[PDB]
Amino acid sequence: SNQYQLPLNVRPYTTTWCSQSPSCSNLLAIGHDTGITIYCASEEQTPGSTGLTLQELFTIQTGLPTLHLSFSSSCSYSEPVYSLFLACVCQDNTVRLIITKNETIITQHVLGGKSGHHNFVNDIDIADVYSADNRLAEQVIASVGDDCTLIIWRLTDEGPILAGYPLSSPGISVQFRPSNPNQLIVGERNGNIRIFDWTLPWLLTLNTLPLVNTCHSSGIASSLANVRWIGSDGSGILAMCKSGAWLRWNLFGPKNLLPNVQGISLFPSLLGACPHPRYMDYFATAHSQHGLIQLINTYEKDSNSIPIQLGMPIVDFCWHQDGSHLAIATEGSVLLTRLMGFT
Amino acid sequence: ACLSRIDANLLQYYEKPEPNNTVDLYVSGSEYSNCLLLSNSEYICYHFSSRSTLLTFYPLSDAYHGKTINIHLPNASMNQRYTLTIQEVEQQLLVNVILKDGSFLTLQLPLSFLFSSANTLNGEWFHLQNPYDFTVRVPHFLFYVSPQFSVVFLEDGGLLGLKKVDGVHYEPLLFNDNSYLKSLTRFFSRSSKSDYDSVISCKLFHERYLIVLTQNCHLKIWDLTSFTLIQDYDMVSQSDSDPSHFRKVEAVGEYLSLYNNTLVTLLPLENGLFQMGTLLVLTYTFQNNIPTNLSASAIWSIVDLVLTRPLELNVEASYLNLIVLWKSGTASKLQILNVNDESFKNYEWIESVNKSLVDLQSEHDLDIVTKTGDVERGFCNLKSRYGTQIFERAQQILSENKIIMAHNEDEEYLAN
């Protein structure tokens, strides 16, 4: 493990790799109480133990807390100059898209007030949509909140298009489908899981609550932590409960009648699962409060693998695109740790 | 299923799983429980403990703030609650209990005291007494008839009378019994541990007639004016006389209850026969045998039955209603037999749901509302759902069995 300190007065809230855009996949953003900081990951000589070190590049000041953070495919590099596009959520309950050239915010769009969410925003994600001619036609941001609303915010050539959709319960996560921006997934706090075609009722709703194996009772309150697609065509869906209970469904052949596989993490997962970018069957989950991280294999290859235990709480974490490195933001730092097995 | 189950834990709203006002009286409840209505329109509940050493009283409509009274007994009753009676005489709960050693204990609990704040009781609230020698001929069933009179039933088959002269003392008024003379036959002995045809159920009719059901399902009828056996019906020789097996009832239970002049009796043939005739003058006259609808082998036991005036059911064609409570382990079954007409030949069985909605939803994972997520969230969820009495009893059973919460997020614990 190598450890890189965040500035002394910087409290991290969120950590994400720029896996969404290959030109910028070595860029790391930390949303904190005064903005979003960008770091670069480089192969040093090091020892080929952790043959990867972190270089802090710069800090984008915003003046208020950043709670969720997503890079877009529009990110680019030039010589040098970084052209960034970031979706995030701020203390004023607004959802924003910030477009920068390095630390300087050259452009900012803000969706808030009554036109925005009418309660706390719980999650956000972003994807670039191109026309048939293949110019940038739209950038699309999806967000979910405690106002029982899902918001699709499309920024198009002739300007913004806003749309709201009602939910049976607070939205706790949302993510567009890989290799198919026409589809996306929305998570409700109550266990409902929506598959949605925004170009169009919405196509499908699964639910983890009634499926709990109950060989070991998952408890009275098993609030849904997370749902994410897996695979590079978005061939699968993985859902994780706060309790640690997880379930996986695949989407291809024949007729289907239950979720394909199911299990339970050793610990609660407040932050939910972070699926491996290269190995579908694998995902990571943290015991954020004691600072341990379990690695789970869906086809039970795993047998309780806990590669990571810190002596401190974990605020957030995410896989580097290479699949062997992990970046983890803790309350005062970010660690890059390399698991030798995944190399 | 026309009825549903609503479960009530009278302490559910409060944190303390026990009333602050509990008083323990001492004489020099998970085996029986019942309710009794009093002069003041209030229901008093009572419980006789597993050992039959503790009697507990508490007010149905004020369990938490009202007083629960634990009366401790020097020893257990001869034969559980079956050797115990409780009736409201005059502004008092009169409780009599034949104890194991033979003593006949009287309790007098003033109505006031049951609904007072007091933790003390004045005057003679209990009397010990030895009216008969129960060492030789052991009794097993005590039946209240009147404030001064009530009969005792014996294991060997004999009846004893018990007449109150003053206010306290009791004396044996014996009944004529020549049933014993069947000993003369090669098929019965006085000395035999079998052969007893003891009473297993008993009801008082029109203050004077005492209707008894025996282990061989004979309905004998005693006139208390005469103190003489007036009737003796063999209940079983009416329906299909099965030589294979009629289960002579091997314990005291609730095998009959009467309303006006009607009388249902529970006979065991695969545990499934409700005979019901009519009483009239004294004469008992058969009408019909109504079987039961029970399967999975028929392994339900009668808990209690109550014949009574008809209900408001989905069938207007009704004359009488029998409420029936079966049990099989800790699972229960409530049914209502509706008899349509004064002939007991047209009837219909009405079932009910024997689990509450909350329980069914929890079992079948049909609960969409309860918040999910945190391990402590599940804690609040279960705590709030179950109530403190149960939740703490469960946490008691956990630590006894050495199951201890590892950390904040021990999901393996919550499961348990």
Question: What values do phi and psi take at B78, rounded to 5?
Answer: -55, -45
Q: Kindly determine whether residue B382 and residue A218, on different chains, have CB atoms separated by under 8 Å.
A: no
Looking up tokens 């634990």 gives: B70
Partner residues linked to A3 by β-bridges: A335
Discontinuities in chain A with C to N beyond 2.5 Å fall right after 79, 200, 252
Q: Kindly determine whether residue B375 and residue A219, on different chains, have CB atoms separated by under 8 Å.
A: yes
Q: Which of residues 380-409 of B touch A (CB under 8 A)?
A: 380-382, 385, 407-409
CA pair distance B361, B378, nearest whole angstrom: 16
**Amino acid at residue number B286:** F
Is A156:A171 a contact under the CB 8 Å cutoff? no
Task: Supply B51's token pair.
Answer: 């050992």
In the PDB record, what is the listed experimental method?
cryo-EM
Give chain A positions within 8 Å (CB) of B398: none
Give chain B positions within 8 Å (CB) of A268: 374-375, 409, 411
Q: How many CA atoms lie within 13 A of A158 on its CB side?
A: 2
- Other beta carbons within 10 angstroms of residue A205's beta carbon come to 14
Nearest CB among A223, A266, A267 relative to B372 is that of A223
Angle (deg, nearest 10), helices B388-400 and B375-386? 120
CA pair distance B184, A243, nearest whole angstrom: 75
CA pair distance B210, B220, nearest whole angstrom: 8
Give the distance, in angstroms, between the CA of residue A102 and the centroid of all CA atoms in the same chain.
22
Beta strand spans in B66-196 (E): 68-72, 84-88, 92-98, 104-110, 126-127, 139-144, 149-154, 159-164, 170-172
For residue B69, what are the contacts with CB-CB under 8 A and spacing of at least 6? B22, B23, B24, B25, B56, B57, B58, B109, B113, B114
> B365 CB near a chain A CB, below 8 Å?
yes
Report helix, strand or coil for A211.
Answer: helix
Residue to test with chain A: of B380, B410, B411, most A Cβ within 10 A:
B411
